[PDB]
Amino acid sequence: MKYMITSKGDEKSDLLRLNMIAGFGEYDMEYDDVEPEIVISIGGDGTFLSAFHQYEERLDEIAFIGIHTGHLGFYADWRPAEADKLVKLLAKGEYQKVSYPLLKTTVKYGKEATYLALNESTVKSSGGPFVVDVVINDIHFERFRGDGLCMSTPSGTTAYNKSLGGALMHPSIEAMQLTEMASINNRVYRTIGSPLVFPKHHVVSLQPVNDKDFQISVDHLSILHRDVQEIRYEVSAKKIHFARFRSFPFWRRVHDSFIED
Amino acid sequence: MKYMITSKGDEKSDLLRLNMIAGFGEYDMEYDDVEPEIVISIGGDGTFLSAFHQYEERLDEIAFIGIHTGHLGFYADWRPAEADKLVKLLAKGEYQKVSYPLLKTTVKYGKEATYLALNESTVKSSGGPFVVDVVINDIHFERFRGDGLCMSTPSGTTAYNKSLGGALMHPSIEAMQLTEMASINNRVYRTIGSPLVFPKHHVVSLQPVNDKDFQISVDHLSILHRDVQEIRYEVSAKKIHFARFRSFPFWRRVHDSFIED
Amino acid sequence: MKYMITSKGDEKSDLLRLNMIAGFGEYDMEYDDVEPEIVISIGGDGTFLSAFHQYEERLDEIAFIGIHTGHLGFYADWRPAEADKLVKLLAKGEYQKVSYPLLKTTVKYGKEATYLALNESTVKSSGGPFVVDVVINDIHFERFRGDGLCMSTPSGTTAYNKSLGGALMHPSIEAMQLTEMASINNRVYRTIGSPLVFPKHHVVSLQPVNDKDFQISVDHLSILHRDVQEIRYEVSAKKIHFARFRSFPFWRRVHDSFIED
Amino acid sequence: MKYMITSKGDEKSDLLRLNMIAGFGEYDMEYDDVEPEIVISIGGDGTFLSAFHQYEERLDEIAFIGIHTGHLGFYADWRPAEADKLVKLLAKGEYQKVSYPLLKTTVKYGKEATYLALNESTVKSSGGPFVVDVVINDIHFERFRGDGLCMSTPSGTTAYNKSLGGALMHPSIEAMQLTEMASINNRVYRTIGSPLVFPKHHVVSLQPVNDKDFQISVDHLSILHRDVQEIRYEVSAKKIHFARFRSFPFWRRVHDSFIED
Ligand SMILES: CSC[C@H]1O[C@@H](n2cnc3c(N)ncnc32)[C@H](O)[C@@H]1O
Ligand SMILES: CSC[C@H]1O[C@@H](n2cnc3c(N)ncnc32)[C@H](O)[C@@H]1O
Ligand SMILES: CSC[C@H]1O[C@@H](n2cnc3c(N)ncnc32)[C@H](O)[C@@H]1O
Ligand SMILES: CSC[C@H]1O[C@@H](n2cnc3c(N)ncnc32)[C@H](O)[C@@H]1O
Ligand SMILES: CSC[C@H]1O[C@@H](n2cnc3c(N)ncnc32)[C@H](O)[C@@H]1O
Ligand SMILES: CSC[C@H]1O[C@@H](n2cnc3c(N)ncnc32)[C@H](O)[C@@H]1O
Ligand SMILES: CSC[C@H]1O[C@@H](n2cnc3c(N)ncnc32)[C@H](O)[C@@H]1O
Ligand SMILES: CSC[C@H]1O[C@@H](n2cnc3c(N)ncnc32)[C@H](O)[C@@H]1O
């Protein structure tokens, strides 16, 4: 079908991209970066996240594939030496699709903005103390004081979430995971401490206590939001679809990245 | 239907148990501790775990309810002052049932024993260094050296799992969670560090490296197993059923036990 | 001798301050906020840190005392109801002095600025990834990637340091403690993980890898530093002196703040 | 002077030991394993700990040296290829000595036993729940419930202590460090969480609450102690002395073992 290729933009990735486009030229395949059905990302996980956000409006019409020009990625999990075999199998089609859960972030003001994250969304203070009330399904759960909070998708769990002590979750689980950044706990201040894992349909809302300005991140994007009344998290109805050409199990990808490769 | 009541065995719990049996005497309800359809446990979570293991062969024919004579429990989540209202509503029936996932542990030797856990199963060494190979769905994932490992159900996540840094998981998620106890990590030895969350149908197998004797726990029961060839973990096909009489959400129960009550 | 009193500036603290000044009026004591020998801080630990930084140039000529108008402080460890007894004993003098270690931070550019911290100094990135080389006594120890680093004095250990997993250290130990904020560790990136405790005379230097802009904090003060070549940490030669009027051991103060009071 | 050599007992270590004894035969050096002044340990850190405990009664008359036949050790920090140069320099003498702090453990019953640890002493329960009262300098600090507690020397901090989240402390600091093993913290149970670092002269006492049987370890030795009334920890007056032949800084040894070598 229609396809496009994004590149990290270094010499290696651009050449690999030109070679695949030449290869695709020998099949019924049209290059179209407006309405692709296949999006190939050549670079690291940073490049793959950008590809995801470039096409987040057509997630259900796109299958993603990632090629790693440097080290193994979690999203960019094919090697370059296999580009030609990838060209071949993508051209024929008939490939299986694999779907991972995504996170919906809603920011309400005194309008409303919604974002989709593939890894995570984080909340930190503008320039002072961070204090927020955490409300779960309309029930007040804790008053959080500390550096910030992180809400991760399952495939996000190997990223920022892991650095904050979160658990690694297989991406077939439709869930989101909330971790703390440097929480204060003394006689007067009290948080759960532990990461929290939420199923689909649960809503976690962060509400300002004093300061209403916050730094909010979604994957790579970080934006100062002013006059915030609420930040809301829930597992998205939308999913990201990967074109699958061979078996590469999530736990093997974890082993290869963290234990040994 | 037929019901029974277990007691922690202190003065408070026994009296409460005698009072409920007297109350049940005013309805069509037969006391039968052989084939009950309702099992009321009066005591702490320790008492409730024993009630679960007393009837683990008839899980699909029993609905459990727990009354806490001391502090709030996660399983024993009704107060004693409400015993009479509980008598009433249990007698009529028509109550809703709530189901939580369980963990299947299989121990293989050079026969085979299987256990069901409501909280967790743990593995530690007999008397020396603990070294085991962790294999996930037949893929070698890590060689673990340290004090031990813990595999938790979702309702188990607030117990031993929490103490070991694991995440708290809503019990509607069909999953198990593996946490490390004091893992060694240096130049030569390497584990994932992070807790790992597994969906239904994934199989985690622990295999001996040198010593084949291990201390294996399942909830309260701890047994030295000799001549072990494998310990296997998977989400059970079986579930524990709770009689539900009012709303008491899992996250509110977490708040009440860990943040404030 | 000469004394001054700083206030949190709320109604309670100002009144208490006016009452102590009236009380001091009945002894040979002169109010002088230029060259005091006694500095009384009335408020929380935030107020006490400001008092410390107001007089950091005359540390060896000043004995500090803190009164807590709200909850117990670590520095502001006297109750208000005891103000009059404090007036009395401070007036006579002959009190013992207690000394705690401080941290020296040196920031070098392409000039040089030095700061003194009572709690800690932290380093975070301006707006992008944080990557720094950590050099200990001229030996390259690790390349750190993550959110930031924190260097704590012993009395600082109960503050930000504690939130980041650091150990609590008795303040009679002349040392500083380095903790990580959200370090990345995978196949390619590698940090020690654990907090590190350094004795007097050891020098820890942070050196930029790519970006040379950093957010540097010292206690309450947070400043964006541009064109940084090095951040250097060492236990200061200077100490903060407390006027001691009764026994209140550090570990009891830890118990009272974190376990129960 | 008089010297002896202990071996791990594998083929490599025994041969290396025979070669050094032959080499020492060309100098004024007498082999004496009763009253040596130099103790050479050839093997891992396990072998070196045994050498330490073999001669713990003559610590002030002995200088230790460790050769690693396998991977780098923290105590056994010389390579085998340098045995001959070690022979040479040890024979002449005039070498500098380096001293590390040790931990004194006292166990009181309803007599009294004292032990010296080079790494750590740990306390765990015999077979049930572990509950102990932690008393610091006669002040009740916390009631600890969980798996156990670990008290580490500074050179011990890179061992068991590190696995439990403790800080790594330079061995020139005369201190001991207490870490928790799987502490329970809920509404009803409360521990400090954080590792605690104690200076010389502070006394930490563990006192039984219910069960008075405990598994107590000191380095490699693990013993079930019955009828325990108290376990007492303090920095020892005794020190272990190392023969120093070249510079190998503690932090470089940490880097080489944990970051890269
Ligand atoms: C160093 S900043 C983030 C690092 O983690 C990588 N990363 C990005 N997303 C993920 C993910 N989902 N899982 C693991 N690593 C990730 C990035 O490629 C980079 O190496
Ligand atoms: C792939 S580049 C963007 C990703 O970097 C990852 N990241 C940012 N900061 C950290 C950190 N301190 N540790 C691990 N990953 C991080 C976040 O998961 C983000 O989605
Ligand atoms: C102190 S040993 C275990 C403690 O945790 C409690 N407990 C048992 N099971 C659970 C659970 N599933 N979640 C939280 N606490 C539990 C027990 O009642 C006891 O307080
Ligand atoms: C309710 S009594 C049995 C439970 O005690 C809990 N338990 C045992 N040891 C610990 C611990 N160190 N921390 C928290 N819970 C524990 C385990 O989850 C077990 O199922
Ligand atoms: C909530 S931001 C910092 C919190 O920790 C307190 N704090 C400041 N310094 C210290 C310290 N050295 N030890 C413990 N708490 C501190 C402050 O008073 C406030 O409660
Ligand atoms: C007393 S107000 C200033 C202090 O707040 C403390 N602080 C800032 N952020 C945090 C945090 N996330 N956790 C604990 N303490 C903090 C730092 O130790 C600082 O010195
Ligand atoms: C695997 S059991 C202990 C492991 O830690 C090593 N070890 C023993 N003592 C120390 C120490 N003081 N610091 C670091 N590692 C140690 C042992 O040699 C072994 O590799
Ligand atoms: C060198 S062999 C003895 C040492 O093994 C180390 N050890 C035992 N168990 C562990 C563990 N789980 N993690 C790290 N080190 C350990 C302890 O520090 C002990 O002194």
Task: Answer whether D216's CB lies under 8 Å from D122's CB.
Answer: yes
Question: D70 and D33 in one domain?
Answer: yes
Would you say the C-alpha torsion C114, C118, C122, C126 has a positive or negative sign?
negative
Dihedral, B144, B145, B151, B154 alpha carbons, nearest 10:
-90
CA distance B250 to D41: 57
The string over A57-82, giving b where at least 16 C-beta atoms fall within 10 Å of a residue's C-beta and e elsewhere, is: eebeebbbbbbbbeebbbbbbbebee
Question: D51 and D31 in one domain?
Answer: yes
CA distance C210 to C214: 11
Question: A115 and A77 in one domain?
Answer: no
Q: Annotated catalytic residue: which of B10, B14, B32, B45?
A: B45
Tokens of C224: 């964006």
CA distance A78 to B184: 32
CA distance B59 to D119: 49
Element containing residue A218 per DSSP (H, E): strand A214-218
Question: D156 and D93 in one domain?
Answer: no
Alpha carbon distances (Å) from D183 to B178, D146, D147: 18, 4, 7
Residues whose CB falls within 8 Å of the CB of residue B175, separated by 6 or more in sequence, listed in order: A173, B101, B154, B169, B197, B198, B199, B200, B235
Task: Answer whether D117's CB lies under 8 Å from D100's CB.
Answer: no
Could you say which DSSP state residue D194 is in?
S
Amino acid at B4: M
**Catalytic residue positions of C?**
45
Tokens of C195: 């907090």
Tokens of C21: 């000044």
* Chosen from C119, C179, C186 to mutate, greatest number of chain A CBs within 10 A: C186
Question: D150 and D135 in one domain?
Answer: yes
Element containing residue B21 per DSSP (H, E): helix B11-24
Tokens of D119: 């790494």
Known binding positions of B: 45-46, 119-120, 145, 147, 155, 158-163, 220
Instruction: State the DSSP string of A48-110.
Output: HHHHHHHTGGGGGG-EEEEE-SSS--SS--B-GGGHHHHHHHHHH---EEEEEEEEEEEEEE-
CA distance D24 to A181: 58
- Which residue minimizes the CA distance to atom 11 of ligand 5? C159
How close, in Å, is residue B213 to chain D by CA atoms? 17
Dihedral, C202, C203, C204, C209 alpha carbons, nearest 10:
-150
Question: D206 and D168 in one domain?
Answer: yes
Q: Which residues of C touch A160 (CB under 8 A)?
A: 182
Could you say which DSSP state residue A255 is in?
I
User: How, if at all, do strands D112-117 and D63-67 pair?
Assistant: unpaired
Length of chain D: 261
Task: Answer whether D56's CB lies under 8 Å from D26's CB.
Answer: no
- CA proximity to C55, closest of C13, C102, C122, C110: C102
Alpha carbon distances (Å) from B210 to A112, A186, B133, B135, B229: 60, 44, 10, 16, 11
Torsion-angle region of A93 (φ positive above 0: left; ψ -120 to 50: alpha; else: beta): left
Residues whose CB falls within 8 Å of the CB of residue C13, separated by 6 or more in sequence, listed in order: C7, C42, C43, C47, C69
Amino acid at A216: I
Question: A218 and A106 in one domain?
Answer: yes
Alpha carbon distances (Å) from A90 to A49, A86, D164: 21, 6, 49
Q: What is the CATH number of the domain that holds C28?
A: 3.40.50.10330
- CA proximity to D93, closest of D63, D60, D56: D63
Q: Angle C11-24/C83-92 helices, nearest 10 degrees?
A: 40
- Yes or no, beta carbons of B139 and A202 under 8 Å apart: no
Tokens of B18: 């005698």
Ligand 5: atom nearest CA of C45 is 18
Q: Does the Cβ of D46 fall within 6 Å of ligand 7? A: yes
Task: Answer whether A175's CB lies under 8 Å from A169's CB.
Answer: yes
Amino acid at A208: P
Q: Could you give the residue ranges of the DSSP H alpha helices within chain A?
A: 11-24, 45-54, 83-92, 160-163, 250-254
CA distance D143 to D184: 10
CA distance C23 to C26: 6
Alpha carbon distances (Å) from C249 to A52, A125, C172: 57, 35, 11
Candidate of A180, A186, A191, A211 to mutate for ligand 5, largest count of ligand atoms within 8 Å of Cβ: A186
CA distance B77 to B79: 7
Residues whose CB falls within 8 Å of the CB of residue C59, separated by 6 or more in sequence, listed in order: C102, C116, C238, C239, C240, C241
Task: Answer whether D159's CB lies under 8 Å from D152's CB.
Answer: yes
CA distance A175 to A102: 9
Tokens of C101: 């270690």
CA distance A75 to A62: 15
CA distance D26 to D24: 5
- Which residue minimizes the CA distance to atom 17 of ligand 5? C45
Q: Does the Cβ of C161 fall within 6 Å of ligand 5? A: no
Looking up tokens 């700061």 gives: C115
CA distance A113 to A220: 17
Tokens of C188: 């390619």
Candidate of C102, C152, C163 to mutate for ligand 6, largest count of ligand atoms within 8 Å of Cβ: C163
- CA proximity to C70, closest of C127, C27, C7: C7
Experimental method: X-ray
**Is D120 exposed, middle or buried, given 0-12, 13-18 or 19+ CB atoms closer than 10 A?**
buried
Quote the distance between the C-alpha of residue A68 and its chain's center. Answer: 17
The verdict on whether residue A128 carries a ligand-binding annotation is: no
User: In a 3-state reduction of DSSP, which class is residue A203?
Assistant: coil
Would you say the C-alpha torsion B31, B35, B39, B41 has a positive or negative sign?
positive
Question: C77 and C6 in one domain?
Answer: yes
Task: Answer whether B103's CB lies under 8 Å from B116's CB.
Answer: yes
Length of chain A: 261
Query: How far, in Å, from the CA of D158 to the mean position of ligand 5?
Result: 29
Question: B187 and B141 in one domain?
Answer: yes
Question: D79 and D53 in one domain?
Answer: yes
Q: What is the CATH number of the domain that holds A192?
A: 2.60.200.30
- CA proximity to C76, closest of C22, C39, C25: C39
Q: Any idea what the Cα angle at residue D147 is, between residues D173 and D45, rounded to 5°?
A: 45
Quote the distance between the C-alpha of residue A238 and its chain's center. Answer: 12
CA distance B206 to B240: 26
Q: Angle D11-24/D83-92 helices, nearest 10 degrees?
A: 40
Task: Answer whether C124's CB lies under 8 Å from C144's CB.
Answer: no
Q: Domain total for chain B?
A: 2
User: How, if at all, do strands C148-152 and D168-169 pair?
Assistant: unpaired
Instruction: Find the domain containing A163 and state its range.
Output: 102-237
Q: List residues of chain A with CB under 8 Å from any CB of chain B.
A: 136-137, 139-142, 162, 165-170, 172-173, 175, 177, 190-192, 194-199, 202, 249, 251-252, 254-255, 258-260
Task: Answer whether C206's CB lies under 8 Å from C133's CB.
Answer: yes
Rounded to the nearest 5 percent, the helix, strand and coil shares of chain B are 25, 40, 35
CA distance B255 to B101: 21
- CA proximity to A109, closest of A226, A192, A190: A226
Quote the distance between the C-alpha of residue D32 and its chain's center. Answer: 24
Looking up tokens 């072998």 gives: D47
| Secondary structure of D49-85 as H, E, C letters | HHHHHHCHHHHHHCEEEEECCCCCCCCCCECHHHHHH
User: In a 3-state reduction of DSSP, which class is residue B110?
Assistant: coil
The string over C141-175, giving b where at least 16 C-beta atoms fall within 10 Å of a residue's C-beta and e elsewhere, is: bbebbbbbbbbbbbbbbbbbbbbbbbbbbbbbbbb
Tokens of A69: 């020009």
Instruction: State the DSSP string of chain C.
Output: -EEEEEE--SHHHHHHHHHHHHHHTTSS-EE-SSS-SEEEEESSHHHHHHHHHHTGGGGGG-EEEEE-SSS--SS--B-GGGHHHHHHHHHH---EEEEEEEEEEEEEE--EEEEEESSEEEEEESSS-EEEEEEETTEEEEEEEESEEEEE-TGGGGTHHHHTTPPEE-TTS-EEEEEEES---SSS-----S-EEEETT--EEEEESS---EEEEETTEEEEE-SEEEEEEEEEEEEEEEEE-S---HHHHHIIIII--
- CA proximity to C145, closest of C161, C123, C167, C162: C123
Tokens of A100: 């991972």
- CA proximity to A65, closest of A85, A51, A81: A51
CA distance B137 to B198: 11
User: In a 3-state reduction of DSSP, which class is residue B45?
Assistant: helix
Q: Any idea what the Cα angle at residue B157 is, between residues B153 and B160, rounded to 5°?
A: 105
CA distance B197 to B101: 14
- CA proximity to A259, closest of B183, B129, B107: B183
Question: D59 and D24 in one domain?
Answer: yes
- Which residue minimizes the CA distance to atom 3 of ligand 7? D159
Question: A110 and A206 in one domain?
Answer: yes
User: In a 3-state reduction of DSSP, which class is residue B215?
Assistant: strand
